[PDB]
């Protein structure tokens, strides 16, 4: 066809090619042309002519006003941040200075600055630069506290709820509790004057904070209180955030039927309003992938994560913390899915990219590294055992040891000794020590893991079952403590039947462990019995696990808002 370009696109290419001479008069253009000039500068590769223009806060304020092309602004901004110029830090520092300067001005100028800060902080926290998003939200909060007017109280609540989302993503959990205390103080004195603000967003951020800190029971309580505060007038972003956080909170509490409809409604709301290529939609797919990766749904969790990564690889791609989180979450999911075959070339690649991005944009002692350095390690040992060279075996085992020890130290410093995450680190160390032929302290690691898991998650829980399964595999295969392995294997299969039924993936591993257990003690009739059970289990895995793409399983126009939340509330 070869249609000619419009006069708009031809004029853009006639202004960009004369940018350096008319850079002053471009800033006076309409806000919907200024973005097109700057996006053309990005497209031509003239990032330094562009990074010289986005660093000023006033120029970036009008660029942020174009909400239609925010999906292009995220790509442009992410292309600046890995180009070398630190646009995120510069904008935050400039906004902090301007807030500290106009703190003494009237209410209108302060309100305009607070709105500019809300949009800029929403963009920066949306782009993932959390450490450069506190300096904007903290300045907005400081602007809020000066005058005791009512809108100032409500916007201080907004500053606290948005700032709390930044710190949870930045893994500053110790300050999240103080931020929530400040927010609840502001909302208490808001309700003292006779009006109540909406508590859904704040309590959802509490749910995310406590689930990240692995306080599963209190996370469930706070997501209950969050979904008790959901109305139709809420923005769909807040609504879908609350549902996805509550869906994460429901899975760790082993209530999957509620989490099913919760995550289905969250994915539906994210797809209907935002779109199939939106970062919030990518976040909802990450939570959906977490849900599927928990309840036995592994052949589709990778497909969910690949869709989740491909959105973040396109909306804002390169070296970014959200892309790194998608790579890390996919790598563990690909590690689980591809575990049966034994090959790990792709999973290790997706784990290494998550390592190579977080180590570039975050400090080397940051918690998000710990949540990633495990995954690569969990792959390396699996590559290590399947290798054949002994030097390579030992080197990859020691590399996994270093990664697990660093992650364990970070988790122990952040949360503490008695937590689920530290117990998971202990279990990883125990299975690695089993892989490293050091079986004496492998038992100590596994028992330390189980005594912390069962104390917090109860005697019957998925993590407890997995840890005791690892301990039983240690006992029956290598430490020759066959008598103690039987009760642990029975506990593992019992918890698997209670939670996941007979379709659990680890049932194959524990049934093979039981086969080897009974072969050693010569009880051949039990060998025959569990061989028949294993064949039945394989048939079952071949029966109710059909090809059902979860991007389609969410359907279209399901139970809408005020219906899924109500059913979930009355289902308590």
């Amino acid at each position: 066809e070869w249609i000619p370009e419009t006069l708009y696109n031809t004029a853009i290419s006639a202004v960009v090619d004369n940018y350096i001479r008319s850079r002053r008069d471009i800033r006076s253009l309409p806000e919907n042309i200024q973005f097109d000039v700057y996006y053309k500068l990005y497209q031509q590769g003239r990032l330094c002519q562009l990074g010289s223009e986005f660093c000023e806060l006033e120029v970036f304020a009008k660029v942020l006003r174009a909400l239609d092309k925010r999906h292009l602004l995220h790509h442009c901004f992410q292309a600046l941040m890995d180009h070398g110029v630190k646009v995120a830090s510069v904008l935050a520092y400039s906004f902090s200075r301007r807030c500290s300067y106009i703190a003494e001005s009237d209410a209108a100028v302060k309100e305009k600055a607070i709105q500019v800060g809300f949009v800029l902080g929403g963009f920066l926290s949306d782009a993932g630069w959390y450490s450069d998003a506190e300096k904007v939200f903290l300045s907005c909060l400081q602007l809020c506290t000066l005058h005791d007017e009512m809108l100032h109280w409500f916007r201080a609540v907004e500053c606290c709820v948005r700032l709390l989302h930044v710190r949870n993503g930045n893994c500053k959990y110790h300050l999240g509790e103080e931020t929530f205390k400040l927010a609840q103080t502001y909302m208490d004195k808001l309700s003292k004057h006779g009006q109540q603000a909406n508590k859904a967003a704040l309590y959802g951020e509490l749910c995310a904070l406590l689930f990240a800190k692995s306080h599963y029971d209190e996370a469930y309580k706070w997501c209950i209180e969050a979904m008790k505060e959901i109305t139709a007038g809420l923005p769909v972003k807040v609504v879908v955030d609350v549902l996805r956080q509550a869906s994460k909170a429901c899975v760790v509490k082993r209530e999957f039927k509620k989490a099913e409809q919760l995550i289905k409604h969250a994915v539906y709301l994210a797809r209907d309003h935002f779109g199939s290529k939106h970062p919030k939609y990518s976040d909802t797919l990450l939570d959906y992938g977490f849900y599927l990766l928990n309840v036995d749904n592994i052949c589709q969790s990778v497909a969910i994560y690949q869709a989740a990564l491909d959105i973040r690889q396109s909306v804002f791609g390169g070296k970014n913390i959200h892309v790194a989180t998608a790579h890390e979450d996919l790598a563990y999911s690909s590690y689980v899915h591809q575990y049966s075959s034994g090959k790990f070339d792709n999973a290790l690649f997706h784990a290494e990219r998550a390592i190579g991005i977080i180590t570039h944009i975050l400090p080397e002692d940051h918690l998000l590294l710990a949540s990633s350095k495990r995954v690569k390690a969990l792959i390396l040992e699996e590559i290590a055992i399947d290798c054949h060279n002994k030097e390579t075996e030992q080197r990859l085992l020691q590399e996994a040891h270093d990664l697990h020890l660093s992650s364990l130290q970070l988790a122990k410093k952040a949360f503490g000794e008695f937590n689920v995450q530290t117990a998971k680190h202990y279990g990883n160390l125990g299975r690695l020590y089993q892989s490293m032929r050091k079986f004496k302290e492998a038992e100590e690691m596994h028992i330390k893991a189980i005594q912390i898991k069962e104390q917090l998650l109860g005697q019957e829980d998925y993590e407890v079952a997995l840890s005791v399964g690892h301990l039983a595999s240690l006992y029956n295969y290598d430490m020759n403590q066959y008598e103690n392995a039987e009760k642990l294997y029975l506990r593992s299969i019992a918890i698997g039947k209670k939670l996941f039924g007979e379709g659990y993936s680890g049932l194959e591993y524990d049934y093979r462990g039981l086969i080897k257990l009974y072969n050693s003690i010569g009880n051949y009739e039990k060998v025959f019995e569990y061989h028949n059970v294993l064949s039945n289990w394989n048939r079952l895995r071949d029966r109710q696990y059909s090809v059902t793409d979860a991007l389609e399983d969410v359907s279209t126009s399901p139970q809408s808002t005020e219906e899924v939340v109500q059913s979930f509330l009355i289902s308590q």
Partner: peptide, 9 residues
């Protein structure tokens, strides 16, 4: 495949 899978990430 001696062992089960990793706990979580």
């Amino acid at each position: 495949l001696t062992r089960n899978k990793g706990p979580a990430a």
